[PDB]
Structure 1
Amino acid sequence: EPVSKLRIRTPSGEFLERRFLASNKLQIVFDFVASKGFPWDEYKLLSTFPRRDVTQLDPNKSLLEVKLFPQETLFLEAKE
């Protein structure tokens, strides 16, 4: 049942968008952004209010546990 929609803004401005079952582990999300041109070691995933480096959270926790449900806008930012 629980589905979380994520809107992820790329550095260029465009939004990736995707629904995930909230029970899904964060690593599934990491794989999705890497499926685009934004692999885990080149880019970090950030949530805001409060600021969090989502790519530095436990990959084995679900979206639900890390509270990325039901909606969330995230930002991809080059790691430097």
Structure 2
Amino acid sequence: NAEPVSKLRIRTPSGEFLERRFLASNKLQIVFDFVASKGFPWDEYKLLSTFPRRDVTQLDPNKSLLEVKLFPQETLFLEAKE
């Protein structure tokens, strides 16, 4: 019934917030591009999902959001690959 849209607040390394409205059919690559389209990236940034405390809700920039289900409201953190 209806698609699960994920609204996330992604904090940056400077104390910024990337508010993002996600269409459950969107793609992590879009999430990554949207935030790096805001004030980042440095070349290739990775977000950290706080709720599950994991590499950007399951990771996989080529995965869709339903596969990584960013819930309806989730907070992520901006981080640099390591």
Which of the five TM-score ranges fits, normalised by the shorter chain?
0.7 to 0.9
After TM superposition, the score normalised by the length of structure 2 is 0.77
Alpha-carbon distance change, 56 to 64 in structure 1, aligned in 2, over 3 angstroms: closer
CA distances 1:35-64 after superposition (whole Å, capped 9, x unpaired)? 123227442200134321128722232222
Alpha-carbon distance change, 40 to 12 in structure 1, aligned in 2, over 3 angstroms: closer
* Alignment partners' CA distance in 2, 1:30 and 1:75: 11
Q: CA-atom RMSD, angstroms?
A: 2.3
Q: Is the 8 A contact 2:6 2:71 kept in 1?
A: yes
Q: Is the 8 A contact 2:47 2:77 kept in 1?
A: yes
| Amino-acid identity (%) | 100
* Alignment partners' CA distance in 2, 1:40 and 1:66: 24
Q: Which runs of 5+ in 1 are unaligned?
A: none
Moved more, 62-71 or 25-34: 62-71
Deviation at 1:76, TM superposition (A): 0.6
* Alignment partners' CA distance in 1, 2:27 and 2:42: 15
Alpha-carbon distance change, 55 to 79 in structure 1, aligned in 2, over 3 angstroms: farther
Alpha-carbon distance change, 2 to 50 in structure 1, aligned in 2, over 3 angstroms: closer
Aligned partner (choices 57, 60, 67) of residue 58 of structure 1: 60
After TM superposition, the score normalised by the length of structure 1 is 0.78
Alpha-carbon distance change, 44 to 60 in structure 1, aligned in 2, over 3 angstroms: closer
